[model samples]
Target: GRPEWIWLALGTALMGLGTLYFLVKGMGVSDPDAKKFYAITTLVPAIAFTMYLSMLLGYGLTMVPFGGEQNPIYWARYADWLFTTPLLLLDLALLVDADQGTILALVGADGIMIGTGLVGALTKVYSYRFVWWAISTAAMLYALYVLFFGFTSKAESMRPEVASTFKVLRNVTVVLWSAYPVVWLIGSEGAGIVPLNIETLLFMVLDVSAKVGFGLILLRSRAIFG
Candidate 1:
């Protein structure tokens, strides 16, 4: 329905504005590390949703034999994820006080996920597509494990209030991110278990929760932990 597109557009606008607001706020902060953290984290979703908005407005490419049929392929979404997912890992890394090497490793895992996912999305051969999907899913799972388990010890070592916030954000990230693979399974691209429109709706919901909601959580944590 038109309402879905309209709401998605509205969400895109809200996310963009929120990102700008956070960027300005980050600039005004006195701590250089915090300033960079806030600005980079907020910037990821801004660029991501801008691409999403453009795709919704008919700016992306279409592919034949997609999900066993001709379908519109928003390749930019993969591009967005390629860049934004690492920034997301960076946000988590900053939250849990992860070292530079560990953060880079997580970013590398995220790159694998997005890269393989893009290959899955574009491949015409069904078996090859599944192979790429499996690889991407594995990469994503590894990233999640790093976010949830690898950083837990560090998170717990922080101040009590900070630890509490970290725990909440960590759980939130895992719970929300865990849904993506499920969505992929049911969406048109995988099993066609859900209609394309419903898949779009599911994605919009998840995107808002993961990006916009997570951004708000970061802002709140800044107030609490800063």
Candidate 2:
């Protein structure tokens, strides 16, 4: 029944409310440094909830190809976007605020500082890429563990194969997109634009090399197994 998707809709709603509560309450009392941490905590849950909603809608709505409009569950798209759109907006706001400091500079230097961090996390750099990659990797690993080693006892309807496929694509997208940061960091160091920091360079090398290697393996696996 189309009503089955209601579970996802309810879950998404609860996540949104939790995110709003944390973001608002946390920001209200938090000092500058602590605010960043608080915001991150809220943001992480928000992203997680939205990602799940997207996956659910993507799989359930497209179960039978070209059956979107005919499906009684068409409302899933609306529920999906309700959570995802706000999630994306909040993420962008964080990024923009990271760089610019604050949307309004009236509060003084503290406001400006926080806003700048937000903006930086969003626009001035590869904040989205970093956030996406880190989250995707973790989520994929956890989902895989749950699929194989954990309960493996969820309802058949809730255990759609496409949800798992979505995770694969999410992981692939993260690794593929992560290469830019590595290239940028390397180029910056080579040109002396950035200080030659060994730890930083090592991190970039490891991150880039690992992802690139994994991406190649994914491609080969698809060719051989698909």
Candidate 3:
């Protein structure tokens, strides 16, 4: 297997293990809010593992026959995002006690971001593809605005330790998510700015860090909050 495939296998393994840990840990939490937090946390990696597993199995293969190589379509990842991103927004909403209306708005933005991103990835027309990219980017910026401004204000009003942890998680989320569009531009079919294999590697690094690494930070914050 190629190095990218190996890394993907490793990622899937790690995410699978992390999912198990979070599911078990969530069950142990007695606090209703914290239990809900950990339960939602489990879904992030669980969803990710499904996508990684699809990539491992060569689903969604996009072949470059002339180049004698292929790239995975990553539709699975987009599908995963359709579900997981909203759950992530929910996690943030819970942390900051964001209003349900505001949370739904953020979730809507995330839906546009991921949905248009998937459309962009699948599109063959360069101009149309870029239009989808633009829509997705706008949606992402709006979600970030909600996170930084909307959620941050609420976090500041919380206890000191909770506020501190929120800052760390929020910053990490912003940095990680902000990088995603860049990766998409490089790897998407219309752009192809980077080789497919390299794109796979970059995405794997981001995925593992964002899902597994972020999950650990979330659990830590839960412990501190409790």
Candidate 4:
């Protein structure tokens, strides 16, 4: 009766539950800054829930011709990433007490990465598509720098507990973020080595981990709550 609705519904429910978890857990937190952490964390999954809902409704999707075949591309996912990636950056930046300049730069680089990536997925010319991919890859590399080496000292300056939590969180972020490009290359956006359904499932798992799992680690660690 439905095509790929299972994956879409699963994403929606997971993100919905993610939002609820933050809100319920947030009630126990007392710090003003901690509340901000909870609020932003809550929003990440809330936004994702809506995006998945849209996907379930068959909105924000398109078919693009690639390699003489029509590739299913979910532009809504890009729309979701464009907004959520920077929010994730902001959350991590605040966690590490990064300077305003570094936060701004991180957000900028993340924007370029996602923007170029969306264009790369949509463009008709096979050769030119890789050009955008290169640009996006460059942006992602810069983001990795900002997330890893650039934030190291700042992360280190925090209290031992918080600093350690930051280390773990950043590592988690990097690992998940790195998988995105890999998935892109093998999925419909690149060589179509994987089918769209599998692609969707992979992205759903990544999103749940990146947003909900990341938030859970931070919130449960008591670093932010402290």
Best by TM-score: 4
Rank candidates by lDDT, best first. Answer: 4, 3, 1, 2
Lowest lDDT 10-residue stretch of candidate 1:
1-10
How many angstroms is residue 209 displaced in model 1 relative to the true structure, after the best TM-score fit? Answer: 1.2
lDDT of each: 0.75, 0.36, 0.80, 0.88
Sequence-dependent TM-score of model 4: 0.96
- Where is model 3 poorest over a 10-residue stretch in terms of lDDT? 63-72
| Model 1, TM vs. native | 0.89
Runs off by more than 4 Å, candidate 2: 1-3, 52-61, 64-226
Per-candidate TM-scores read 0.89, 0.27, 0.90, 0.96
Candidate 3 regions exceeding 4 Å error are: 1-3, 62-72, 222-226
Alpha-carbon lDDT of model 4 = 0.88
lDDT of 2 by residue, 1-226 (tens): 3434454555556555666766776657535644553554466446645653674465423321111222111223234323332332232233222223321221232233223322222332334424433443343344334322321232122234423433443444345334433433333212224332332344333322332232233222311121
Better by lDDT, candidate 2 or 1:
1
Candidate 3 residue pairs in backbone clash: none
Q: Flag regions of model 4 displaced more than 4 Å.
A: 1-3
Comparison by TM-score, 1 against 2, better one: 1
